[PDB]
């Protein structure tokens, strides 16, 4: 029932008052049962009936599907949720299974009506205040506000953690070792301790948590190997994803698509690469709960993909901190970077993979890096160390792009991983000019009203070229240019450029980009044999940069 | 411990409101150890317990100021800093202390533990707090918000300043040729002695605060004599190579901006035609005349350049080989205060992030003991991979601010 701890004081947002939303009415029938559900509930005093004084008011709903055979009565704080400060939503993430380690004996208890029996701020509940409509319109509006948790209101999450962590805190000191993990109505509790010894504890603990108002049920996973906790399985050697299944529907409402954004919040957290984005954007342009919202190409495109995601079955082993823990990482899709985060070989905790702009032009080892990066830090959250890496790249191919590269960089411990999509540097631009190789004093410009402009060189053997070009960029007409000397070209050449944007895309030593002729460039680059690109200052007298200028640029 | 005090009452600046910064994934080794500092720190009185009800928060981590000792935490409170009342005229120190710079020794001292004395305005507590992660997630991190005057903050040392004035008062009045200047958590002591007879003097501050109160941990040394300059420097192969010729006319074409008393005229004549970079072109004596007068003018302190106290230091640092960095402190682009080239990096300290890392304590500390303010930085880096890292290496109590960039080739014209 209620419990009788401390209750935690809550503030409106500076300024801001509290809710005054309208109720609309519902039907006779859903009305009947929203005051029986309501009746009910003030009879354990979840809630509590009202006077013509309180001014504030939100919007009660009644959702049609029944859950556990349950129809109930949903309020509407979006608006109560606009005005309640701001809560500290304290952790770094959910918890990670691969992170556990194994405990002799686990059961994982249920917190039934968790919300509800955790008491709100006196204060604070004039705020909370709604109206159960009449059916006999003769009669007025049936007013209520809550004593206790409601269950979609903004604190409700923030402060039943807080609640719950003091009702379980003398319980951690008195037994240590025992590992309790809170999360949303999800108890879980393990030791290494014999089931009879074990269940003692237990009853201790759910005896404990009765003295403070916190009912949990009959309906406790007594130790029966699979588990269910977050949306995992615990298995006695491994655990697994429960299935995400999403909703698939042609009428979505504001409700539906709300509820989903919450599943998908959830999900993205088990499997990445899950968007909310476009379905979001949904909620903000409409109101009313129960009204309908169409999915947009994008939000429909979106719930696809992110369904796809779900496709993929997630599963691994725990942890045994006695050992190391190994990340292997593999190169794939000109971007796609899958690893693995094991202890005994072909025993993995954690899989994933990575896969992430590095910028509008990218180069690989640069790539593997940043993989390293989140993993190290990944594992950081999980386990509370860094792991040893296995990485495809050679011990010397490394050296030569740190010894190269103008931004500092590190990638801590790894050993070679000799396995297929090694990593590698394709070109290594030269550092002095080639003796004899062609010299091409490359240039290009454009205009920003027109879009045309010219692109080309002019050789120290007299070869000239200057290509006219449409819907281009004073910018990408410099690349173009640089295109030019390396096509028209030996193996060796030596251009000169007196572009700065075109200097920093080629010598940070691209694989890949998303500008075509960038990749033109890069696939040339790779063909030669000894590039060297040098820059010099524009618009002055220096080489023939100060004839090739002439012929590209406009009124002179 | 906490002396009866009323305390002075301090506001963020208006407007803006507390810092709700995140944290950051901390190992197993640093969580044991803020736990550990915290629990003792809270039987103290000095930080407290709080709910989900207070918004804000700071980053916390640990350090270990040298080597092989104890864990240091390390509040994080930049952010609250930057929202902070700038107080009235007691500032964090005062009018900065010009020779401190001109000592032959300063040795750095922790200070930090006198502000754990002096309680904290009741109302601005809620915007110190902070919390322990856990690791996996599985206790719902420990908050604390501080009850007395938190080490990080820039109003400590506002506060407390009539309290150190007078703790170093006698110290002062004995030893009157020795410079004290404070920043934050630090005392920065310097004296024209011998390293062996200003390492007494050090022990007797040490000792007298001790005597006082303040328990400093039992000197970092800084010679602020032989701090010196990285000029811009001209090539041996001059007039050589086409190419050569041309990474030359690039080179002072840059410069033009910082002084623009060079001239370009006598070298680009040289670079008229469309030749090859191989090429070793003419030594003319009319382009030996630019190239002198080049040299020497980059052998000179800039023009118009002079600290203004109202403009933030910046600090551009380069990657330049084999353990060299080089950097740049200005206000104004282009007018810069100093330039300098960090260099001591070579196999167990041949990691990158490290190297940065001591090169943005050093290029901070002079900062400190030269102006008196810390420099906005520049990083050479990728903010992931920096923020994967620093903490690592991180060992002075306060942390600067920082930007990240992209290094053009402004490498091969500054070393």
């Not at chain 1, 070209?489 to 002729?517: F, H, M």
């Not at chain 2, 190579?241 to 080179?251: F, R």
């Not at chain 2, 980059?298 to 118009?304: A, I, S």
């Amino acid at each position: 029932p209620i419990s009788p701890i401390e209750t935690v004081p809550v503030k409106l947002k500076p300024g801001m008052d509290g809710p005054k939303v309208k109720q609309w009415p519902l039907t006779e029938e859903k009305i009947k049962a929203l005051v029986e559900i309501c009746t009910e509930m003030e009879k354990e005093g979840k809630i509590s009936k009202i006077g013509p004084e309180n001014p504030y008011n939100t919007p009660v709903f009644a959702i049609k599907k029944k859950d556990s055979t349950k129809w109930r009565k949903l309020v509407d704080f979006r608006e109560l949720n606009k005005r309640t400060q701001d809560f500290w939503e304290v952790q770094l993430g959910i918890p990670h299974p691969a992170g556990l380690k194994k405990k002799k004996s686990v059961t994982v208890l249920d917190v039934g009506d968790a919300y509800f029996s955790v008491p709100l701020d006196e204060d604070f509940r004039k705020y909370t205040a709604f109206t159960i409509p009449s059916i006999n319109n003769e009669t007025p509006g049936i007013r209520y506000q809550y004593n206790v948790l409601p269950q979609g209101w903004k604190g409700s999450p923030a402060i039943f953690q807080s609640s719950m962590t003091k009702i379980l805190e003398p319980f951690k000191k008195q037994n240590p070792d025992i590992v309790i993990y809170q999360y949303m109505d999800d108890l879980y509790v393990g030791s290494d301790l014999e089931i009879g010894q074990h269940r003692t504890k237990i009853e201790e603990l759910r005896q404990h948590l009765l003295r403070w108002g916190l009912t949990t049920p009959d309906k406790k996973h007594q130790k029966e190997p699979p588990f269910l906790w977050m949306g995992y399985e615990l298995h006695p050697d491994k655990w697994t994803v429960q299935p995400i299944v999403l909703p698939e529907k042609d009428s979505w409402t504001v409700n539906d698509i709300q509820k989903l954004v919450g599943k998908l919040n959830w999900a993205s957290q088990i499997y990445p690469g899950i968007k909310v984005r476009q379905l979001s954007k949904l909620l903000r342009g409409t109101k009313a709960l129960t009204e309908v919202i169409p999915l947009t190409e994008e939000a429909e495109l979106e719930l696809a993909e992110n369904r796809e995601i779900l496709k993929e079955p997630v599963h691994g082993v725990y942890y045994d901190p006695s050992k190391d823990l190994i990340a292997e990482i593999q190169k794939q899709g000109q971007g796609q970077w899958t690893y693995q985060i094991y202890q005994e070989p072909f025993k993995n905790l954690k899989t994933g993979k990575y896969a992430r702009m590095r910028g509008a032009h990218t180069n690989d080892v640069k790539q593997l890096t940043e993989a390293v990066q989140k993993i190290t830090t990944e594992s950081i959250v999980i386990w509370g160390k860094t792991p040893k890496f296995k990485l495809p790249i050679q011990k010397e191919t490394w050296e030569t792009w740190w010894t190269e590269y103008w931004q500092a960089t590190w990638i801590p411990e790894w050993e070679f991983v000799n396995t297929p999509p090694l990593v590698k540097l394709w070109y290594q631009l030269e550092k002095e000019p080639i003796v004899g190789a062609e010299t091409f004093y490359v240039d290009g410009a454009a205009n920003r009203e027109t879009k045309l402009g010219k692109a080309g060189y002019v050789t120290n053997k007299g070869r000239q070229k200057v290509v006219p070009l449409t819907n281009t960029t004073n910018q990408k007409t410099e690349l173009q240019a640089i295109y030019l000397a390396l096509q028209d070209s030996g193996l060796e050449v030596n251009i000169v450029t007196d572009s700065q944007y075109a200097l920093g895309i080629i010598q940070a030593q691209p694989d890949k980009s998303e500008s075509e002729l960038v990749n033109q460039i890069i696939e040339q680059l790779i063909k030669k044999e000894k590039v060297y690109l040098a820059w010099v200052p524009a618009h002055k007298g220096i080489g023939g940069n100060e004839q090739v200028d002439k012929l590209v640029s406009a009124g002179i | 411990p906490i002396s009866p005090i009323e305390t002075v009452p301090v506001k963020l600046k208006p407007g803006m409101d507390g810092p709700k910064v995140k944290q950051w994934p901390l190992t197993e080794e640093k969580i044991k150890a803020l736990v550990e500092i915290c629990t003792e720190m809270e039987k103290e009185g000095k930080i407290s317990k709080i709910g989900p009800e207070n918004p804000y928060n700071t980053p916390v981590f640990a350090i270990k100021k040298k080597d092989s000792t104890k864990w240091r935490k390390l509040v994080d409170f930049r952010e609250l800093n930057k929202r902070t009342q700038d107080f009235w005229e007691v500032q964090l120190g005062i009018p900065h202390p010009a020779g401190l710079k001109k000592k032959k020794s300063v040795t750095v001292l922790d200070v930090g533990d006198a502000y754990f004395s002096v309680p904290l305005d009741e109302d601005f507590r809620k915007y110190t707090a902070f919390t322990i992660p856990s690791i996996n997630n599985e206790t719902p991190g420990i908050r604390y918000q501080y009850n007395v005057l938190p080490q990080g903050w820039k109003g400590s040392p506002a506060i407390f300043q009539s309290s150190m004035t007078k703790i170093l008062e006698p110290f002062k009045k004995q030893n009157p040729d020795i410079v004290i200047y404070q920043y934050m958590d630090d005392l920065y002591v310097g004296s024209d002695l011998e390293i062996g007879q200003h390492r007494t003097k050090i022990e007797e501050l040490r000792q007298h605060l001790l005597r006082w109160g303040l328990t400093t941990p039992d000197g970092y040394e800084l010679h602020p004599d032989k701090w010196t300059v990285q000029p811009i420097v001209l090539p041996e192969k001059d007039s050589w190579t086409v190419n050569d010729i041309q990474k030359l006319v690039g080179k002072l074409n840059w410069a033009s901006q910082i002084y623009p008393g060079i001239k370009v005229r006598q070298l680009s004549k040289l670079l008229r035609g469309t030749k090859a970079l191989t090429e070793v072109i003419p030594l003319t004596e009319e382009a030996e005349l630019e190239l002198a007068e080049n040299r020497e003018i980059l052998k000179e302190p800039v023009h118009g350049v002079y600290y203004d106290p109202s403009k933030d230091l910046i600090a551009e640092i380069q990657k330049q080989g084999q353990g060299q960095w080089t950097y740049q402190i200005y206000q104004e682009p282009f007018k810069n205060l100093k330039t300098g080239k960090y260099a001591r990096m070579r196999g167990a300290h041949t990691n990158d992030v490290k190297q940065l890392t001591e090169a943005v304590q050093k290029i901070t500390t002079e900062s400190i003991v030269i102006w008196g303010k810390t420099p906005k930085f520049k990083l050479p880096i990728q903010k992931e991979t920096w923020e994967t890292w620093w903490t690592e290496y991180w060992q002075a109590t306060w942390i600067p601010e920082w930007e990240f960039v992209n290094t053009p080739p402004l490498v091969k014209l500054w070393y």
